């Protein structure tokens, strides 16, 4: 039985909707980690060697351990599951690093599930038919959750189509759905005093409502950038980890649907 290992707790929950037991998949970074500057254990070094496969999300965000994949067992390769999705930069002024959050999109979740599809199906052909089923069934369970959001969140006037964050977390989402996107930082890993003041102005100057943190970060910046702002903090987000199992995002289906439902709640 072939083992896939996923760099982190969102594409190991996305490769086990599509392999379902097929494989055994595991995961590097679970949920609750933080992939920037992630400690690779002796354990973990055993999952890097047992891998058959091995799932990153690449857009950087491997970058401090990517090392750490070496003396890999024959035959196995290092699949960029992002492969195909335009990259959108740090630099909040439009050439920087990339941002690594694309699975914060419909359309990109679709792509995930596709280069995954993809990849099991070359490790594993004798398969191909059962990747091939699971992949459209996942696909459509996303679709079938996530596009009502959408279809609200399209309604929003104009002028209240933004999406304020701490991490520059939804700017994929907003180049998905239409939006402008704000934030204090890009990647929460670090900071910057004249990003807050650009979102400060920018809040003020468009008439922004609502500014929101995320499940790994801290609330305060967010709330600070209210105050001063006259808007309202918009609460907590789930955009870099799956949740705890008995927490509201413990798949990724559940992160995109917890995230945009507390979104769209907060537009309307």
């Known amino acids: 039985k072939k ?8 594409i190991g929950d996305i490769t086990q909707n599509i392999a379902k037991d ?20 002796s354990a973990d070094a055993i999952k890097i060697q ?42 909040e002024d439009t050439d920087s690093e990339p941002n690594p959050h694309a699975w914060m999109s419909l359309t990109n979740a679709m792509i995930y ?18 990747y091939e089923l699971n992949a459209r069934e996942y696909s459509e369970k996303i679709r079938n959750s996530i596009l009502p959001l959408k279809t609200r969140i399209e309604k929003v006037d104009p002028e209240k189509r933004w ?15 239409g939006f402008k996107s704000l934030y ?23 008439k922004i409502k609502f500014i929101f943190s995320e499940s790994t970060n801290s609330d305060q910046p967010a709330k600070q950038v209210a105050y001063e702002t006259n808007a309202s903090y918009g609460g907590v987000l789930y955009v870099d980890s799956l949740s705890k199992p008995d927490g509201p ?14 979104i769209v709640d907060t537009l309307f």
Request: net charge neutral; aromatic share 8%.
């Open 50 to 91: 047992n891998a058959d496969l091995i799932l990153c999300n690449g857009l950087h965000l491997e970058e401090t351990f990517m090392k750490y994949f070496t003396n890999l067992k024959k035959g196995t390769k290092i699949i960029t599951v992002t492969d195909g999705i335009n990259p959108i930069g740090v630099s």
């Open 3 to 10: 083992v896939v290992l996923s760099s982190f707790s969102i």
């Open 163 to 177: 999406f304020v964050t701490s991490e520059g977390c939804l700017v994929y989402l907003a180049e998905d759905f």
């Open 249 to 262: 995002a413990p798949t990724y289906l559940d992160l995109l649907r917890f995230s945009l439902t507390k």
């Open 184 to 206: 204090l930082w890009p990647i929460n890993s670090d900071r910057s005093p004249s990003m807050m003041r650009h979102a400060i102005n920018q809040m003020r100057s468009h």
């Open 113 to 130: 599930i596709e280069n995954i599809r993809k990849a099991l199906t070359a490790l594993d052909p004798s398969n191909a038919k059962k």
């Open 22 to 41: 097929l494989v055994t998949v595991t995961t590097l970074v679970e949920a609750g980690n933080d992939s920037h500057s992630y400690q690779v254990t």
